[PDB]
Amino acid sequence: YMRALDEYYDKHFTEFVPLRTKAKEILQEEEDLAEIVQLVGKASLAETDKITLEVAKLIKDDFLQQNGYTPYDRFCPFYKTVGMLSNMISFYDMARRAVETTAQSDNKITWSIIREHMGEILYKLSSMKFKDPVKDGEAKIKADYAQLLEDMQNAFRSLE
């Protein structure tokens, strides 16, 4: 039904279709790597492939899974869903840009450097699921996700 619904997605959540396509691409890429890494180990990974693996782990652990018996995630409106996906895919894009701009330099950014520098931002991306749709209003949750986006857009600038 995905092709039937885009007529409605593009006029209620205009960003959601590209976000969804990128999320699926990311999970497919991590699936493709998984067979290689299992047999070979992470030493062979490219620096963009490390970002793919780590963003996929972020999405699986902290966007896909949803403890259905908790006041924060028994229900998850679509504003919250698309917000979480937008932040995670924006993180992915910024990290891949940071890697592809400094792979040719002496200022080489790596997943380890990003991890160390943004241990906080990654934990926020991990704890986005705990925002409560009713205990915290839609406006509050969207504002907090926008603020996390700002925090990330500042962290990456300060990293580079």
Add this chain to the structure above:
Amino acid sequence: SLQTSFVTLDEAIKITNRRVNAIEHVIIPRIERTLAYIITELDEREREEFYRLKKIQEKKKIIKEKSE
């Protein structure tokens, strides 16, 4: 020359042990599990065929009783 050979052999040994462990801990067990599953499912096909043939035989016997 000795040291260079030593280092390169260290790398080669690490890689080959990783390959051997990969095979004998992932690839071979995967194939063994698939083989067990294949044998079980072929037993299932055979059992279903046996049941169908048994049913046909019973129906032929009942036909004999219906005709005689």
Add this chain to the structure above:
Amino acid sequence: YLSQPRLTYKTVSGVNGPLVILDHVKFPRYAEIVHLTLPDGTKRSGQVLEVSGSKAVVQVFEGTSGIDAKKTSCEFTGDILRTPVSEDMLGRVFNGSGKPIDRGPVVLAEDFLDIMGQPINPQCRIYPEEMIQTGISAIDGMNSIARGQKIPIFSAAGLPHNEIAAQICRQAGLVKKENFAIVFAAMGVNMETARFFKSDFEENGSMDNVCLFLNLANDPTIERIITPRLALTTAEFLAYQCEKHVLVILTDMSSYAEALREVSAAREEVPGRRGFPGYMYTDLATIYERAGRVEGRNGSITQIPILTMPNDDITHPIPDLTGYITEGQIYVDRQLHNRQIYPPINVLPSLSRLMKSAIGEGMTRKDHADVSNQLYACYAIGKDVQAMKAVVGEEALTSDDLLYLEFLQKFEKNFITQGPYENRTVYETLDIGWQLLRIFPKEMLKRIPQSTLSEFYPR
């Protein structure tokens, strides 16, 4: 003609799934047709599956729910299922049994034809050599169709076989250097698929050439035994008598085969593989083998069945026997679809047994056969190398294996991948195939003779 009154029996002796066993029938005729008046006036139809002395084992098309002994009245029509046919069947939509569901009147018979169809003499069946430019490159370049070939689209649950079939229908035409009538037998297609096919045939303005026989998912499940026979009988009337070139689509031969299984189990026949009747090969042959040209006649029937392979097992009886009977299968692959490659045609397990004589000088081009063979070989080797890469990693691969992997990637990206509304002429498909072969050096293109290498490779 039949002047004698029809006998009507209230003598039902049994009801058993789709079957209705009568008794005291006067001289039953096998394959006879029967009109069952149920108690409440509902009138159903059925075919005599077997006769024995005074017994008949009717097979009720519209199902047996509501039938009862002692009040159901079976009128024995006295003749095998003769369906009406007329040229104005083109541009109509009929239900599974050939009754109208487009709110137009019944088909004022131009003639009556036996839905089984009178078999054609192999000595005066012509060989189909005119290639159909389907527009889909994964077909034209490598598994080309010829006008008269039985070439099913094997596919699976969830793949876009409907989109592929619609694209072929709206793009097929002879090679340039004769406009297809369509006869479309929907069997067990859900409403979404039936409405997709119908809306596409209207959108392309083709409706004046399309004759739909719908047997939806919710329609009775024995009717889809005769729906494909109705479709091919109308196709034969349009082709071998009206002289039109007809493209027959059959939407789900697996739904047909499962209707066959239902009847076989109801009859308690000795069942073959996976429970399907043993005679499935013959019964599917009587459906598929009604394609092809014939001498004197100018028409032809192209036939493009569609198969849902259960569990994607191409060795399952339906795809297996269809592959025995039909001249090679196009094959729609889940591993490509999940990667989002449309059309998901996998060129390795698909072939067109009449391709070889439908391509070459004067017909498509001199390099067609060689490009097809070489792309197939390079793709196969690329798949083997791709399997190896997972084991040995990209360090252990030779640069030649890397060439093959790049060819595989760009082959799926350029050659197979295609716009649903884009019809690549055979010439464009060949140029796009050469663009890939020129990834390799000439020395590695072993399946192309030196003449056709030198002529085409460097340009």
Add this chain to the structure above:
Amino acid sequence: YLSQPRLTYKTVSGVNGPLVILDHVKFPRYAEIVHLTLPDGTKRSGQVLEVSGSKAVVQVFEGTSGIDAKKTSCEFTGDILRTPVSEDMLGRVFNGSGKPIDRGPVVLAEDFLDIMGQPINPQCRIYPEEMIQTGISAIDGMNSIARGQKIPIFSAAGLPHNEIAAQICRQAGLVKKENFAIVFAAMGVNMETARFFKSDFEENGSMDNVCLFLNLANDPTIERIITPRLALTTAEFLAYQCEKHVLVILTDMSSYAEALREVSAAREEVPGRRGFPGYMYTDLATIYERAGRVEGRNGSITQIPILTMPNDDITHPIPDLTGYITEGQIYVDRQLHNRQIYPPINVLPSLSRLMKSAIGEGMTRKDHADVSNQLYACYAIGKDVQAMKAVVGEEALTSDDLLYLEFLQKFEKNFITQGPYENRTVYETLDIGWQLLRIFPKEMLKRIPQSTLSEFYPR
């Protein structure tokens, strides 16, 4: 009540497998009980599996060996199999048919209950919410049992499941920080297992409160079909009429399902997977779903089926269907028993569907859900890290993988490992869970929210 003298038929008409097909039976009743005086005076019993016309396919419980056709006398009790039940059943030993084998007198009925019981109208069925503190950490902390939950102990031949079941029986109690009655049915159990359980219940003073049904390894096979139903009927009499809190144990439901397969094969019923009857789900559910608590009645019937997973294969029909029917499963693991961890509860495939409601604020503690979930995640990742180091060796692991392996070791050493007579409170189990969660920095406890972490993590 039946006032009419009961008919004794000698008119046997065949004997096939366990089935005595009587004929000339007068108004035979389906599921009636038949008493067979064999030629030599041996009295067997049986149940009418089928009636047709005058026939009666009496399935004999003790088998058919010695049945003479013209001399066996089958008296038709005129009623379905009704078990006498009285509270005096507590503290007794019965054989698989309910006949005493403790040299006590036959049960002086307080009532006669249809052995098959009746379903509880779901609208008046209370949802198990009181937690049973089994004392086992792997249960109370990650699979906590509610009172009324159907929760089998999946195990394999040779494992400690006997010891685990005895431990649950000897330290089960509510988390309110009155005795359980126990009904223990055993099927196909060897004399060693019967002695183990009897000796355990007697060593503890509980034997006043236990009521054993024994069908040892060499007692009749078909009698195992009804032994669970006798046990659950007594459990229902005690729980829903005498208001005891009954814990039922059904030992070797594998040795039951194979009795089911034996009878169903002798009947030639349609087989499911691995030859087991097509309705084994329905039958296993007829057993298991006699559990839970009832509106307005203070009693309850916990169930702890024990079953031997054949070949340790949790996809085997017995464990699979039991998984679909029951409210979880405590999975007992060879890969731990061979390391001599006790109890070898491999939590990762264990499950308890009523933990989610049996834990939380005001019942046990308010961190319980998060602690359990985090222990699951950390255990799973630790197992994955072990499987990874099997390939890449110690050198390639990062400090986080080393952290997870440290957690896995200390988890199987502290949390799972437990004294066979050690009775850990749920609070102690949760605190031991925290000692392990503290192996990690907070941000690696991704399943626990900040409000929980900031309160419990530090101490």
Add this chain to the structure above:
Amino acid sequence: KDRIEIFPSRMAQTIMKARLKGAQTGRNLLKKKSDALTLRFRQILKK
């Protein structure tokens, strides 16, 4: 994942036995290569 995802059949059983023996041959050859590299490496360390 657990299984190779070939569909049950006698053909599949034959292919899987061939593949199992292929992987075991690979294991043996690579283990001997590792033993050669290990003997050489040990010799080289001693020298």
